[PDB]
């Protein structure tokens, strides 16, 4: 998912 | 309450460069992702990139070909976004909009700008 | 990247009547984690998109019940129930599953006559 690391 | 506000107008000559603003309040800045979001007059919506305000890490969108600068200011809790060599194609309305955490992608786009309406002209 | 398809670029529609639009994307948007990341977004005319819709199926603080979205995998719909006059607009899908995130084309709702 975007913007997770 | 979680707002973004924005300037309702910039107005810019072409090969000149604009830089628009996004003040957040009601909330912790640092935490959410800031996305930029482009909408030409009578089309779609198109993201243009975003930024972790907590370190300044970006994304851009290919399509702008390292014409788009994102940066933020954590004293203001301001996200900026600059824009190079403007021609007529990027006249256009921005939106400021808030993304997730880090850690949870739930809260994407769940808060909006009023956007800012950028005419390119001589 | 991920192309998003709405289907009904404008749908003509009744108030007091149902209402169904789909957004179909190029690849799987269910994420490793389990979850799937499609929000749709109202814009209504002179304002800034709002979201109704996290989460295939989430609605958000305040939509009210008649929004229903569903789906799964490629293929995902958002349904009213009953249409009123403050759900005309132009509604966008998004992926935040795969990077970059896309949106949509969007489908305009307009009274039919």
């Known amino acids: 998912a975007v913007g997770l690391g | 309450q979680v707002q973004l506000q924005q300037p309702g107008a910039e107005f810019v000559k072409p090969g000149a460069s604009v830089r628009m603003s996004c003040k957040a309040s009601?909330?912790?800045?640092?935490?959410?992702?800031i996305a930029w979001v482009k909408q030409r007059p009578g089309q779609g919506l198109e993201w243009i990139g975003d930024i972790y305000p907590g370190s300044g890490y970006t994304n851009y969108n290919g399509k702008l070909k390292n014409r788009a600068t994102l940066t933020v200011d954590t004293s203001s809790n301001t996200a900026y976004m600059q824009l190079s060599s403007l021609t007529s194609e990027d006249s256009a309305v921005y939106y400021c909009?808030?993304?997730?955490?880090?850690?949870?992608?739930?809260?994407?786009?769940?808060?909006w700008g009023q956007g800012t309406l950028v005419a390119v002209s001589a | 990247d991920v192309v998003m398809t709405q289907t009904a670029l404008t749908l003509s529609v009744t108030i007091g009547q149902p209402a169904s639009i789909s957004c179909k994307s190029s690849?799987?948007?269910?994420?490793?984690?389990?979850?799937?990341?499609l929000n749709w977004l109202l814009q209504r005319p002179g304002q800034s998109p709002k979201r109704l819709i996290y989460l295939v199926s989430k609605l958000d603080s305040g939509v009210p019940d008649r929004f229903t979205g569903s789906g799964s995998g490629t293929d995902f719909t958002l349904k009213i129930s009953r249409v009123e006059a403050e759900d005309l607009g132009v509604y966008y899908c998004?992926?935040?599953?795969?990077?970059?995130?896309?949106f949509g084309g969007g489908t305009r709702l307009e009274i039919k006559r």
């Open positions: 998004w992926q935040g599953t795969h990077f970059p995130q896309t």
């Open positions: 009601g909330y912790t800045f640092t935490s959410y992702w």
């Open positions: 690849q799987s948007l269910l994420d490793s984690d389990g979850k799937t990341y």
């Open positions: 909009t808030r993304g997730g955490t880090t850690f949870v992608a739930e809260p994407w786009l769940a808060y």
